Amino acid sequence: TNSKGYRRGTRDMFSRPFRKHGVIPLSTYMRVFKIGDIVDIKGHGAVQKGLPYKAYHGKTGRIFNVTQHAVGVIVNKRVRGKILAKRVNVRIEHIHHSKCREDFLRRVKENERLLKEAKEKGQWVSLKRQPEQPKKAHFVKKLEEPIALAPIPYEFIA
């Protein structure tokens, strides 16, 4: 009859997944985050002074706090419906980077350079993003082994 309160429902979430227990790495005690370096909020089991509570874990956010050994985030969570902002304070080793910006920054500097090579011939930019297309119309020699090549099933009886 309960959630209500403060750490219930942490079966596979809040601990350490397999073969990573014990002493923390020291890479994540080194990282640096400016204002606007978009970052994630996730779970941990090796700094037991601080957590993001039962709903947040698995969400990412902006950073507008720079402090002693903490990070204060903006994050969106579902109320019904007034989806608000929330300011959560947390010690740093709960937190991983976004890599979702980390494709986009090399989407920038290619476009500053591929326009820069375009600045000698003019046409054309072609600088937006497009997924795969309907391709072509080949003609295909066998070339490699003419047809039939006939796999027809018969397998049930066992």
Binding site: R19, G22, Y29, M30, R31, V32, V66, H69, I92
Partner: protein
């Protein structure tokens, strides 16, 4: 026993196997305040062997740890010190070495002259005004115990007397009697000038010839009597204050692929044929009996 015991096992990392760090000091050593972003914390490293004591200056980064300054007792042969490379007297000049070697790097050779005439002076250097903020330094004890009288503080002592900047207290010094100071400040004048060792030559000067055949050996091999030890230090210290040579070396080189030398690792063709050299022998040991 213990078959599947390997499967759920995992380790403590690499330097815990070879006993190099602790990960408990260093993390809360290099726990940089995050408000400062990547201004380095710049700790000082001192490690020791049975023959040598070492002095490093390093700082952490994201990939690892750049070590800007280094020292050994191996350089002290250039400064008139032949033997006794694990003395508290020897601990002083080693910390004194890098204490101006960084001052050649940043050009602060004039300012922060440090404690000049050392007779055991508790001299924290003052932060000067109107110009260069002094380069602070932090102390690591590595894995050794920081008891009152450890030799690692002697490496700090030449560092703090050379102009380096440390939040530094005095209760862990050798000779400062823990019940109760009573700061006998002249005990480091016996420490830094090696008199605590130089008496042991003199108090064994007439008792055992075999004492010299025992420890403080090779002083007899160079005629080092128990009288002139402090002036070897004092002449080294001004020469340390003259210039550290910054370890120029230009052999360049006899290093590469000598000779092989470490048993290149026997690929798949020489693995299974070595098995094939071993498989055909065992059927031959059965074909011998019939």
């Amino acid at each position: 026993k213990n078959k599947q015991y390997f499967k759920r096992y995992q380790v403590k990392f690499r330097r815990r196997r070879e006993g190099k760090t602790d990960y408990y000091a260093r993390k809360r050593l290099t726990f940089q305040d995050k408000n400062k972003y990547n201004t380095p914390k710049y700790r000082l490293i001192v490690r020791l062997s049975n023959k040598d004591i070492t002095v490093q200056i390093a700082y952490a980064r994201i990939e690892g740890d750049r070590v800007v300054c280094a020292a050994y007792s191996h350089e002290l042969p250039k400064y008139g010190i032949q033997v006794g490379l694990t003395n508290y007297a020897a601990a002083y000049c080693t910390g004194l070495l890098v204490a101006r070697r960084v001052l050649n790097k940043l050009g602060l050779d004039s300012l922060y002259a440090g404690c000049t005439e050392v007779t055991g002076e508790e001299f924290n250097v003052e932060p000067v005004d109107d110009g260069p903020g002094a380069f602070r330094c932090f102390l690591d004890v590595g894995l050794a115990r920081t008891t009152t009288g450890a030799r690692v503080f002697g490496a700090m002592k030449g560092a703090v007397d050379g102009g380096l900047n440390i939040p530094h207290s005095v209760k862990r010094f050798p000779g400062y009697s823990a019940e109760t100071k009573s700061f006998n400040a002249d005990v480091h004048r016996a420490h830094i000038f090696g008199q605590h060792v130089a008496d042991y030559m003199r108090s064994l000067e007439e008792e055992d010839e075999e004492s010299f055949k025992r420890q403080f050996s090779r002083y007899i091999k160079l005629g080092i009597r128990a009288d002139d030890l402090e002036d070897i230090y004092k002449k080294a210290h001004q020469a340390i204050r003259n210039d550290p040579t910054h370890k120029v070396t230009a052999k360049k080189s006899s290093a590469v692929t000598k000779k092989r030398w470490n048993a290149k690792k026997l690929t798949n063709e020489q693995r299974k044929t070595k098995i094939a050299a071993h498989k055909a022998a065992y059927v031959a040991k059965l074909q011998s009996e019939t």
